[PDB]
Amino acid sequence: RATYTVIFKNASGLPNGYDNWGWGCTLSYYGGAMIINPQEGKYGAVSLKRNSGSFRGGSLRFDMKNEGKVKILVRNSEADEKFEVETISPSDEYVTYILDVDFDLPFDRIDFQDAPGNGDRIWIKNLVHSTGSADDFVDPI
Numbered sequence: 001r002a003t004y005t006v007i008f009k010n011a012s013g014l015p016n017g018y019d020n021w022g023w024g025c026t027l028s029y030y031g032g033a034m035i036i037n038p039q040e041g042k043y044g045a046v047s048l049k050r051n052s053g054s055f056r057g058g059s060l061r062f063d064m065k066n067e068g069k070v071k072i073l074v075r076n077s078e079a080d081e082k083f084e085v086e087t088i089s090p091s092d093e094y095v096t097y098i099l100d101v102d103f104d105l106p107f108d109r110i111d112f113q114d115a116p117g118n119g120d121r122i123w124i125k126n127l128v129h130s131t132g133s134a135d136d137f138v139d140p141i
């Protein structure tokens with residue numbers, strides 16, 4: 001049976017138990033979205049750092065709208081190893097994504113990066129991990 005971990009639903013600030021180790025951007029919160037404002041030329045990203053513990057495999061589910069391509073990554077801090085999950089095409093409307101994480105190590109950071117590096121904004125809501133697969137994801141949101 002999959003275990004679901006809600007990271008944030010509607011965001012009014014950083015999720016409880018997380019820090020932001022991102023770069024090249026600032027975060028703001030409005031309309032229930034975590035909003036990433038990347039700086040042109042920086043290929044900026046939010047990097048949500050889980051302060052206690054790690055996730056293992058499974059899948060990540062989130063709602064996103066985004067002016068440019070967004071690269072999703074995860075990282076293992078002990079090994080300082082990053083793992084690219086997917087790149088997501090621009091959408092002016094929120095879309096729900098459920099993506100398998102095939103990384104062989106635990107992960108404690110989740111990154112959303114401005115892949116083109118032009119400063120395109122990113123809006124995120126309803127970020128949830130499951131220990132199970134994307135195909136098997138029963139959405140608690």
Ligand SMILES: OC[C@H]1O[C@@H](O[C@H]2[C@H](O)[C@@H](O)[C@H](O[C@H]3[C@H](O)[C@@H](O)[C@H](O[C@H]4[C@H](O)[C@@H](O)[C@H](O[C@H]5[C@H](O)[C@@H](O)[C@H](O[C@H]6[C@H](O)[C@@H](O)[C@@H](O)O[C@@H]6CO)O[C@@H]5CO)O[C@@H]4CO)O[C@@H]3CO)O[C@@H]2CO)[C@H](O)[C@@H](O)[C@@H]1O
Pocket residue numbers: 019020021022023024042043
């Ligand atoms: O929370 C409190 C806690 O803090 C701990 O300290 C934190 C600190 O708060 C936090 O700020 C810090 O965050 C770091 C983070 O750990 C790093 O991983 C991250 O590193 C960035 C880096 O800053 C960027 O410069 C770099 O940018 C890359 C870009 O990612 C890449 O895509 C771009 O690729 C180009 C390439 O250059 C070209 O050649 C060509 O190929 O094109 C590609 C594009 O496709 O290149 C850029 C560089 O030019 O990215 C990395 C990430 O990969 O930086 C942030 C800071 O901004 O983290 C520390 C912890 O380590 C305290 O330790 C603790 O005590 C306290 O409680």
